[PDB]
Design a protein around this ligand. Structure first.
Ligand SMILES: CCCCCCCC/C=C\CCCCCCCC(=O)O[C@@H](COC(=O)CCCCCCCCCCCCCCC)COP(=O)([O-])OCC[N+](C)(C)C
Ligand SMILES: CCCCCCCC/C=C\CCCCCCCC(=O)O[C@@H](COC(=O)CCCCCCCCCCCCCCC)COP(=O)([O-])OCC[N+](C)(C)C
Ligand SMILES: CCCCCCCC/C=C\CCCCCCCC(=O)O[C@@H](COC(=O)CCCCCCCCCCCCCCC)COP(=O)([O-])OCC[N+](C)(C)C
Ligand SMILES: CCCCCCCC/C=C\CCCCCCCC(=O)O[C@@H](COC(=O)CCCCCCCCCCCCCCC)COP(=O)([O-])OCC[N+](C)(C)C
Ligand SMILES: CCCCCCCC/C=C\CCCCCCCC(=O)O[C@@H](COC(=O)CCCCCCCCCCCCCCC)COP(=O)([O-])OCC[N+](C)(C)C
Ligand SMILES: CCCCCCCC/C=C\CCCCCCCC(=O)O[C@@H](COC(=O)CCCCCCCCCCCCCCC)COP(=O)([O-])OCC[N+](C)(C)C
Ligand SMILES: CCCCCCCC/C=C\CCCCCCCC(=O)O[C@@H](COC(=O)CCCCCCCCCCCCCCC)COP(=O)([O-])OCC[N+](C)(C)C
Ligand SMILES: CCCCCCCC/C=C\CCCCCCCC(=O)O[C@@H](COC(=O)CCCCCCCCCCCCCCC)COP(=O)([O-])OCC[N+](C)(C)C
Ligand code: NA
Ligand code: NA
Ligand code: NA
Lengths: 115, 115
C-alpha cells in the first residue's frame, strides 16, 4: 500500500487529469446554462459543472439531470460512454504496471523491506 | 474461497476500517446536523452519519443528499473522491497478494488439499 501511494498513484493521476480536462472543456460547451430559472441555481460555472460530473460518474454517484437538459443530449452521452472506456483503460494498465516484469519480485521487495 | 475468507479477508478488513475511521472522523465535522427540521430526522449522530455513507458509497448505494446540505460542499466531495482511490488501491493489492510469488502454487495448494 505504501509502495503504490508514494510511487505509483501520481502515474495514474497525471494521466487522469488530462483525460478529465480533455472531456472537461468538451462537455462544458454542451451544458445549457444554469440561470434558466435561478430558483435553485447555485452552480459554479459552465466549466465547473462539466468537471464535477466526471468525478461523480467515476466514483459511481452520477445522475442524468444535465444530460436531459442539454443542447445535444445524444452527443452529451457518447462522450460520457467514451470517458468510461478511457477510464477503464487507465485502471487496467495500472494492474499490468504493478506486475512489472515478474509478479514474484513485487512480493520479494515487500518482504525484504518489511524485515 | 475457503482460503481467502479464513486467511486473507482480515488483511483487507483491518486496513479498511482504519481508512474508514480515518475519513469517518473527518467527514463527521463537515456534515450539518440533522435536527434542522426534525420532521423526518431519525439519524444516529454526527459520527454515525459519516460512517454509514462510506459503506453505501463502497457497495454502490450512495446518494448526494448530505453533500448538498453540508458546510463545505466541495471539500466534502474531495474526501469522497480520495476515499474511492484509497479503496481501489486496497482492492488492487488484494489481487497481487493472492498471486504471492507464483500464480501456479496457489493452484497447486488448492489441488493437493482437495484430494
Ligand atoms: C514541474 C515538474 C513536473 C511535474 C509533473 C511530474 C511530476 C513527477 C511525478 C511522478 C514521476 C516520478 C518522478 C520522480 C523522480 C524521477 C525518477 C523516476 O524514474 O521516477 C520514479 C521515482 O519514484 C518516485 O519517487 C515517485 C515520485 C513521488 C514521490 C512522493 C510524493 C508523494 C506522492 C503522493 C501521491 C498522491 C496521494 C495519494 C492519494 C490522493 C518512479 O518510478 P515508479 O513509479 O516507482 O515505477 C516503479 C514500478 N516498477 C518497479 C514495477 C517498474
Ligand atoms: C484524450 C482527451 C479527451 C479527448 C477529446 C474529447 C472528445 C472530443 C469529442 C468532441 C469534441 C466537442 C464536440 C462538440 C463541440 C461543439 C459544441 C457546441 O458548442 O455546440 C454549439 C455549436 O454548434 C456547432 O456548431 C457544433 C455542434 C456539435 C458538432 C458535433 C460534431 C463533433 C462530434 C465529434 C467528432 C469529432 C472528431 C474527433 C476525432 C475522433 C451549439 O450551440 P447553439 O447555441 O445551439 O448554436 C449556435 C452556434 N454558435 C454558438 C457558435 C453561435
Ligand atoms: C493542482 C490543481 C488544483 C489547484 C489549482 C486549481 C486549478 C483551477 C481549477 C478549477 C477552478 C477553481 C478556481 C477558479 C475560480 C473559482 C471557481 C470557478 O471556477 O468559478 C469561477 C467561474 O467558473 C468558471 O467557469 C471558470 C473555470 C474555467 C477556468 C479555470 C480552469 C483553469 C485551468 C484548469 C486547471 C489547470 C491546472 C490543473 C493541473 C492539475 C467563478 O468563481 P465562483 O464559482 O463564483 O466561486 C468564488 C471563488 N471563491 C469562493 C473561491 C472565492
Ligand atoms: C465507443 C462507443 C461510443 C460511441 C462513439 C464514441 C465517440 C463519440 C463521438 C461521436 C459519436 C457520434 C455522435 C452522434 C450524434 C447524435 C445524432 C443522432 O443520432 O440523431 C438524433 C438522435 O437520434 C437517435 O436517438 C439515435 C439513437 C442514438 C444511439 C444509436 C443506437 C446504437 C445502436 C447501434 C450500435 C452502435 C453503437 C455505437 C458505435 C460503437 C439527434 O441527436 P442530438 O444531435 O443529440 O439532438 C439534438 C437535436 N438537434 C440536432 C436537432 C439540435
Ligand atoms: C488483539 C490484538 C490483535 C488483533 C488484530 C490482529 C488480529 C489477527 C488477524 C490477522 C493476522 C493473522 C494472525 C494469525 C496467527 C499469526 C501467524 C501469521 O503469520 O498469520 C497467518 C495465519 O493465518 C491465520 O490464521 C488468519 C487468522 C484468522 C483465523 C480464522 C478466524 C476467522 C476468520 C473470519 C474472517 C472474517 C469473515 C469474512 C466475512 C466478513 C496469516 O497469513 P496469511 O494471510 O494466510 O498469508 C498467506 C498468503 N500467502 C501464502 C500467499 C503468503
Ligand atoms: C489514512 C486515513 C485517512 C487520512 C485522514 C482523512 C483525510 C483528512 C483531510 C482533512 C481533515 C479534516 C479537514 C476539516 C477539519 C475541520 C472541519 C470543521 O469542523 O469546520 C468547522 C471549523 O472551521 C475551520 O476552522 C476549518 C474548516 C475547514 C478547513 C479546511 C483545511 C483542511 C483541508 C485538508 C488539508 C490538510 C492537510 C492534510 C495532509 C495531506 C466549520 O464549522 P463552523 O461552525 O461553520 O465555524 C465555526 C468554527 N468553530 C466551530 C470552531 C467555532
Ligand atoms: C468490533 C467493532 C464493533 C463493536 C464495537 C462498536 C464500537 C462503536 C461503533 C459504533 C457505535 C455503536 C455503539 C455506540 C452507541 C450506540 C449508537 C451511536 O453511536 O449513537 C450514540 C451517539 O452517536 C455518536 O455519535 C457516537 C459515535 C462516536 C463514538 C463511537 C466510536 C467508538 C470508537 C471507534 C470504534 C471502535 C474501534 C472498532 C475497531 C474494530 C447514541 O446512541 P443512539 O443512536 O441514540 O442509539 C441507542 C443505542 N441502543 C439502541 C443500542 C441502546
Ligand atoms: C486526488 C484528487 C482529489 C482532490 C484532492 C485530494 C485531497 C482533498 C483535500 C483537499 C482538497 C482541496 C480543498 C478544496 C476546497 C474547496 C474550496 C473552493 O474550491 O472554493 C469554492 C468552490 O469553488 C469551486 O466550485 C471550484 C471548483 C471545484 C473543483 C475544481 C475543478 C477541478 C479541475 C482541475 C483539475 C484538478 C483536480 C483536483 C487535483 C487532482 C468554495 O467551496 P466550499 O468551501 O466547499 O463552499 C463553502 C463556502 N464558504 C467557503 C464560503 C463557506
Ligand atoms: Na452504481
Ligand atoms: Na465496479
Ligand atoms: Na500473472
Amino acid at each position: 500500500i505504501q509502495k503504490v501511494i508514494l510511487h505509483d498513484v501520481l502515474k495514474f493521476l497525471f494521466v487522469y487529469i488530462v483525460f478529465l480536462l480533455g472531456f472537461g472543456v468538451a462537455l462544458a460547451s454542451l451544458i445549457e446554462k444554469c440561470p434558466k430559472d435561478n430558483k435553485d441555481c447555485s452552480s459554479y460555472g459552465s466549466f465547473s459543472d462539466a468537471v464535477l460530473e466526471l468525478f461523480k460518474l467515476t466514483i459511481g454517484l452520477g445522475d442524468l439531470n444535465i444530460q436531459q437538459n442539454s443542447k445535444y443530449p445524444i452527443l452529451f452521452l457518447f462522450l460520457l460512454i467514451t470517458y468510461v472506456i478511457l477510464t477503464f483503460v487507465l485502471l487496467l494498465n495500472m494492474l499490468i504496471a504493478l506486475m512489472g516484469e515478474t509478479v514474484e519480485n513485487v512480493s520479494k521487495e515487500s518482504e525484504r523491506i518489511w524485515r
